[PDB]
């Protein structure tokens, strides 16, 4: 009964997500897990920096970066448009399974609760929260997280959309030139009503 | 023949001394108190029972002395160096029953110094700061800025490091740090023409020389402190 | 029945009706600032006598304020011998001490919470 | 096997909850979902403003409104006492299922973990958190949520209670007279130990 | 089918955890629950003060106290080293069941997601959050929580480690001498990727 999970796998060997719009050759490792809990989906997301440009974000006092996941009518990730460049799959130990996804649609943000192209219900398409970044000196810097759910579809393929934006605006950078090692975000867990299977 | 508690444990030194860092976690070894005797070890009349006779200032209860081991730890009440810079303890060692009896036993002094950590953001006491620059003068103190910090006097946690938030892209002002009073000496290092009416106000941010402690980092909002600069209109002639 | 009874500490649920057929049941709710303790009933039924069967507001008890411990070298005492709101609490300092703060506190109902009119005082050595 | 959900449904057609005691008839739309997760229940709650008076609350600097839910011995919502005026039910698509509730009691807060009329354990009956309001300028205005669980009964029928108090008290209100469009709160998720089925 | 839960039980009769090593005669009551949610485990943790020395902490400005849970290779609590001095077990009503633990290993933090003795991934071993303390005047007091998952082993038996540190550092203490009654912290919920069964 692992078909209730849809994730990128625990610590994939190679980077699997392209976040920084200023670079190519996907530059980070986005660990994402979606768990079906009754009528909700628990989303458990964090990012591990790999490329030097990403890891250098910690040396700046004002950062923002977004992961955009677009899903077709069947809930399969659009690897061409999505920041994540590897399909999600079910739990198989600590790694992704191999095979067709069993009811991927059930993991997607519900169109009814979260609609497209509706300025009257726009405010219902936002979720907010906070995570933390652990510095070298063991300081937990707070990072604001904004999740936009399936509000606007860029193309025809996109049936569902999750946009997770990390941002921070602090006083002194969490790291200096000689101390930045990797930009790991503390896990962020949020909830959203899920589309019918 | 059975050994009896006819003597007392002998402290290895009259005045034990140690130190512990401020904001230290719970249950971190502050010191170890050593005392011994000349009886058969591991017996009722030879086991050494340590006990804190008294603690100056006795409040809050920030230290704990284990009776079986003699090692002084910190407790859940986290230390605060600014509240109390140092602690004194009157301790004693016993044997046999290990409880306090009518007969006194030799007591020792344990002095524990709290080591200061940078857990206080400097603040600018002066609310109205304004200099008066004399025209075309170089290497002249433009003004001074008062900075206060509750951390230990004289340490890197107390000295103020001044940085220019803005208004000095022209390389006109430089701020030195007077460590005698922890103040910012704003001096002018370039010539200014009053006819040019160079708008010399600027804005600076104050921070301690050492990096701020993890308890206050990520809570540091560097509010810019503006300073207005006036330039004298020297009457060269008409 | 033409009159569902009114009580000090328990209010009828819903809009009162001019007349209720025999057997109709009317339920009450303990008023804002009062809380229910079992097993007394909080409802009644209109009998064949056109009289509501006996029901009292003894089910609801008044909200009480937080407990206060005696000030150091002092003595706190419920002025009215309890902690329900609308009542007061008195403080006395021992022979060798004097009071520094409010002598008497009043426990008042703000909305649905009973709170003390200030913080407990302390006694200071003369 | 949708019996693990007890919710109001997704975006009910008509307003289903009356919060403002100063108003009559239903004034908002309370979306509440309870998921049975082993020894806990996850509650997912938010409000969609409907009435003009309720929506105008965004203009006031200091506001607080409480949704009261009272449940009887069987865990069924007491309509006449609770702010929500329509019973919860199991999941059926994006709407409420129709029929008797399968073990409603299981979704109710545990009386042992959260007691009644016990002044020595009062502190155990409280949960706190923060939700967010998406302002017209797309900034997140924080709102404090206080949840009080089955501490005090009100009649001989109330066996469990959930009071969800939204509030804020700030210098500036989230909106002004001309910009107030609708009052919706970002979803709030909390957890509580559940009474035995 | 309660095997999905592993908890201390609801309100144990007697103190079951010793947080302050400065005291003996277990000085607190730790309510900790772990529930499987697909590939994650949801942890639901709070503490009830029992001893006088524990309950007196509310009168102090600065406080920090840590609950340490070390679990062996089979997923069983090491009571000798752990602050929690009673084994965890499955849900049997509102109490702990008696018998062998069914797949304790499944509830342990994942070694892959959270490794041992690897500085390069140190930042991955931290979770953060906030709980609350309900004061006598009913004003919520925020308490910071830091959870460290299996970063360092103490002896050859420790195979998994969870250190939950509650702390607060403010200007005024939550209570005063004549008002402090008991230290009960609002429940804190966090998530972690779980080791394979």
Numbering used by the authors:
A (entry chain B), D (entry chain C), E (entry chain A): 129 to 325
B (entry chain D): 100 to 337
C (entry chain E): 1 to 126
Q: What does the original paper state about this entry?
A:
Interactions between HAdV-11 and CD46 are well-characterized and clearly depend on the fiber protein, but the mechanism whereby HAdV-11 engages DSG2 has been still unresolved. The structure shows that DSG2 and CD46 engage different HAdV-11 residues and interfaces without overlapping.
By playing with the stoichiometry of the two receptors, we successfully obtained a “super-complex” composed of the HAd11K trimeric fiber knob with only one molecule of DSG2 and only one molecule of CD46. A large data set of HAd11K/rDSG2/rCD46 was acquired by cryo-EM, and the image analysis shows that there was a mixture of different complexes in solution even though the molecular ratio of rDSG2 to rCD46 was optimized to produce a ternary complex. Indeed, populations composed of rDSG2 and rCD46 alone were detected along with a “super complex” of HAd11K interacting with one rDSG2 and one rCD46 molecule. As both rDSG2 and rCD46 bind with two different monomers of HAd11K, they have one interacting monomer in common. But as rDSG2 binds to the apex of the knob and rCD46 the periphery of it, they do not prevent each other from simultaneously attached to the trimeric knob. In the ternary complex, rDSG2 binds to HAd11K in a nearly identical way as when rCD46 is not included, and the details of the interaction are, therefore, not recapitulated here. In the super-complex, rCD46 binds to two different HAd11K monomers at the periphery of the knob in a very similar way as it has been reported in a previous crystal structure.
